[PDB]
């Protein structure tokens, strides 16, 4: 019918029921339970009304811990006897004890081995902390098992830097200082991390490759899997996470160099010393790891539901999020999975009424995402020819709730205005602000640094399923979820993240009780999808892009101005880049002026201008791609090789500029910087010409 009919049709009770449904048993990727869930989702989508639902299967590499031999960590004395043992399995949550599909805590794609040796604390295991480790702390990390705390960095970069330093084994634990909200109890009497709680994740530096055995091509039935030696992103070091109870029993005994900084400390009753070994009478004891996990090729299934368009069936608007989870995962992704299922049900009801979208909509319950983006990347690779010439935008959906403060939205600049325009029509679910727009609350609590009246919209960055659609194929990507008070809380993400305690009861009592914040996140994502699919003209704005573009230019300029003298000796000039941005600005202004008054009654010209807007994003990727990262093609928002978490724009220049002071040949490095500036300026000018007048 219209926008409002779809928006109101969304029901919090249905999301409640679906979240109850998907969280009673584990649904780990590549298992019979996940296959049954995929079949159930396919059948539900078919009976809702979806035009065509397929079960696209791919034989992709995955990892599991073997049942007979469990994985754990131990403290071994000189005589060889084991002293302390790490929890073989975190305590089952109340109400979930009979279920035996809960896998023990483990990190995916961790190679087998039984490393033995001393332990060194490396804080958040960032590049900076390693930099402290050798330059000033004078500690040789090579040949020693390492212990790291989560936060501020993806696990992949953590293990990568650990390998570079020469670590023999990597141990991951959550520090309550960064994973225990003050004033809140632990599960099952709070939403903090119990001492048995262990966070889980995959150690993969895929760099958008996808399946580590078939980079660039789908893992079809006839495919040729590369050898395990030539795999991409596979770590060469065993890694297994633990909690903070057992970590404290191990952290306390270690002794040596005192922490150099206050940031080198936490809430646990530990000296938090950095020095290797355990001081005192127990110097002989050392850490020993016991990973016996296996990597095998397992068939994963992506449930793709296509609802055919009515006017432009070729144009696909994709909305999808993963469904695999280490444990029940009531918050990741089943919280988002239920949201996606509710949008699918509402769209099916609308189709049953008779309404037809103006563009074909592709819903996709992905798979194997917790093992790297695997499934989504493989399905994109399979249909790259169709998507990169027909796709419009990809609206990701995952972890709708992480705290009840506001609505955090990360989207490409093209639909910035849309994110604003949609948010004004909605209603605030938060404390206070009854009857006021979600936009007003979002601005009040999360104001944009430039404009007080504007809300703050962050960039896409990396992670999740939008990576392959945005950073490789150049398709607009958007994300929206309810977020906490990052201003006044420290814990990055909710404390009960990727653990057994991610049950339905957690999300109900210690998070959105009425499932109203879930309702509003579903409203936002479904509204973005509906606007992208049922707009006569593509609802993008080039001008904002141009605007924000200048910003990052200055940013990428400023870092270079950290070395003015060098910028004069090698004639390094951003004037080409600045002229490119100024071009982009003027040409985008002219294009928007044309768009404001160009005739819409002619389908040919309308298709022309919609193609212009759609390929404007696709004008930014370069087929050569970023250096050493062919699958990262965006030159504006692709994650950098260093400081991938931070997400600084113009990644090529930033990686060229990163650590530019310590280079053996300054002339060659600055020449590479000039090359990156030339590439970026050419790409911006090419996008501007793509937006320029045709013929």
């Amino acid at each position: 019918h219209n926008m409002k009919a779809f928006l109101d049709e969304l029901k919090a009770e249905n999301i409640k029921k679906f979240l109850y449904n998907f969280t009673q048993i584990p649904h780990l990727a590549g298992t019979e339970q996940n296959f049954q869930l995929a079949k159930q989702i396919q059948s539900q989508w078919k009976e809702f009304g979806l035009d065509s639902v397929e079960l696209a299967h791919y034989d992709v590499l995955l990892s599991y811990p073997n049942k007979t031999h469990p994985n754990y960590i131990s403290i071994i004395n000189e005589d060889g006897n084991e002293i302390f043992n790490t929890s073989l399995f975190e305590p089952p949550p109340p109400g979930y004890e009979n279920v035996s599909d809960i896998v023990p805590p483990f990190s995916a794609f961790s190679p087998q081995g039984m490393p033995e040796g001393d332990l060194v604390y490396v804080n958040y295991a960032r590049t900076e902390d390693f930099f402290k480790l050798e330059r000033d702390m004078k500690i040789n990390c090579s040949g020693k098992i390492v212990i790291a705390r989560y936060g501020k960095v993806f696990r992949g970069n953590k293990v990568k830097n650990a390998q570079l330093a020469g670590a023999k084994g990597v141990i991951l634990y959550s520090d309550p200082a960064d994973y225990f909200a003050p004033g809140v109890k632990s599960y099952p009497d709070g939403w903090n991390l119990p001492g048995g709680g262990v966070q889980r994740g995959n150690i993969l530096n895929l760099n958008g490759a996808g399946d580590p055995l078939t980079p660039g091509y789908p893992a079809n039935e006839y495919a040729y899997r590369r050898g395990i030696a030539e795999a991409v992103g596979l770590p060469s070091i065993p890694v297994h996470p633990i909690g903070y109870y057992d970590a404290q029993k191990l952290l306390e005994k270690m002794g040596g160099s005192a922490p150099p900084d206050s940031s080198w400390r936490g809430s646990l009753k530990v000296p938090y010393n950095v020095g290797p070994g355990f001081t005192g009478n127990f110097s002989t004891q050392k850490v020993k790891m016991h990973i016996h996990s296996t990597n095998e090729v397992t068939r994963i299934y992506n449930v793709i539901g296509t609802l055919r368009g009515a006017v432009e069936p070729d144009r696909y608007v994709i909305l999808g999020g993963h469904r695999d989870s280490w444990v029940f995962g009531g918050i990741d992704p089943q919280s988002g999975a239920a949201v996606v299922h509710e949008i699918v049900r509402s769209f099916g009801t609308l189709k049953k009424e008779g309404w037809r979208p103006r563009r074909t909509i592709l819903f996709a319950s992905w798979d194997a995402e917790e093992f790297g983006l695997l499934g989504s990347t493989e399905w994109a690779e399979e249909n790259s020819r169709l998507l990169q010439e027909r796709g419009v935008a990809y609206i990701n959906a995952d972890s709708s709730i992480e705290g009840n403060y506001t609505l955090r939205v990360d989207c490409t600049p093209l639909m910035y205005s849309l994110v604003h325009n949609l948010t004004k029509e909605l209603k605030s679910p938060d404390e206070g602000f009854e009857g006021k727009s979600l936009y007003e609350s979002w601005t009040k609590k999360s104001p944009s640094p430039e404009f007080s009246g504007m809300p703050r919209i962050s960039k896409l960055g990396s992670g999740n399923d939008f990576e392959v659609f945005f950073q490789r194929l150049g398709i607009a990507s958007g994300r929206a979820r309810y977020t906490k008070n990052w201003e006044t809380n420290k814990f990055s993400g909710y404390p009960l993240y990727h653990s057994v305690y991610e049950t339905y009861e957690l999300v109900e009592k210690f998070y959105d009780p009425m499932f109203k914040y879930h309702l509003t996140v579903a409203q936002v994502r479904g509204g973005m999808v509906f606007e992208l699919a049922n707009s006569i003209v593509l609802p993008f704005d080039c001008r904002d892009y141009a605007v924000v573009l200048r910003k990052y230019a200055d940013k990428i300029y400023s870092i270079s101005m950290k070395h003015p003298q060098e910028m004069k000796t090698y004639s390094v000039s951003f004037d080409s880049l600045f002229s490119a941005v100024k071009n982009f600005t003027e040409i985008a202004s002219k294009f928007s002026e044309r768009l404001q008054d160009f005739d819409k009654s002619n389908p040919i010209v309308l298709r022309m201008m919609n193609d212009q807007l759609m390929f404007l994003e696709r004008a930014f990727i370069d087929p050569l791609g970023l250096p050493d990262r062919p699958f990262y093609r965006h030159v504006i928002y692709a994650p950098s090789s260093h400081n991938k978490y931070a997400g600084e724009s113009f990644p090529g220049i930033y990686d060229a500029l990163f650590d530019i002071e310590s280079k053996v040949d300054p002339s060659k490095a600055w020449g590479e910087v000039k090359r990156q500036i030339y590439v970026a300026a050419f790409t911006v000018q090419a996008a501007a010409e793509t937006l320029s007048e045709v013929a």
């Epitope: 302390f84 929890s87 073989l88 305590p91 001492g195 029993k249």
Partner: nanobody
């Protein structure tokens, strides 16, 4: 809640005594039981402990090969296995239980206390 201690003996040396303590009537899913060795005229020191998560640590690390600790939830019991008994090991042992699964060596924390089995060594 009842915690019975079994495994009495009077081995002079080199014993293989098999101490056992079970949670009969224990209503909490999570348990963190350890053993205390009360010496004659000395405060009961914690020996070794195991949680409901198979996470266990021995506290008498000077007796690493002396003592081993295990458990099984089939018959709901925890086990202490000792080899090469020493004359100074003569003491009265209690198994102590607690809901919170953080392994600890605090006597006052461990509210539940069993009757205790006395091992006399010659």
């Amino acid at each position: 809640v009842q915690l019975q201690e079994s495994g009495g003996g009077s081995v002079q040396a080199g014993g293989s005594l098999r101490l056992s303590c079970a949670r009969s009537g224990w209503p909490y899913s999570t348990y963190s039981m350890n053993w205390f060795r009360q010496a004659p005229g000395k405060e009961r020191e914690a020996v070794a402990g195991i949680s409901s998560t198979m996470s266990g640590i021995i506290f008498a690390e000077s007796k690493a090969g002396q003592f081993t600790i295990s458990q099984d939830n089939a018959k709901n019991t925890v086990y202490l296995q000792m080899n090469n008994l020493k004359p100074e090991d003569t003491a009265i042992y209690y198994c102590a239980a607690r809901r919170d699964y953080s392994l600890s060596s605090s006597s006052d924390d461990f509210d539940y206390w069993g009757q205790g089995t006395q091992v006399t060594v010659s």
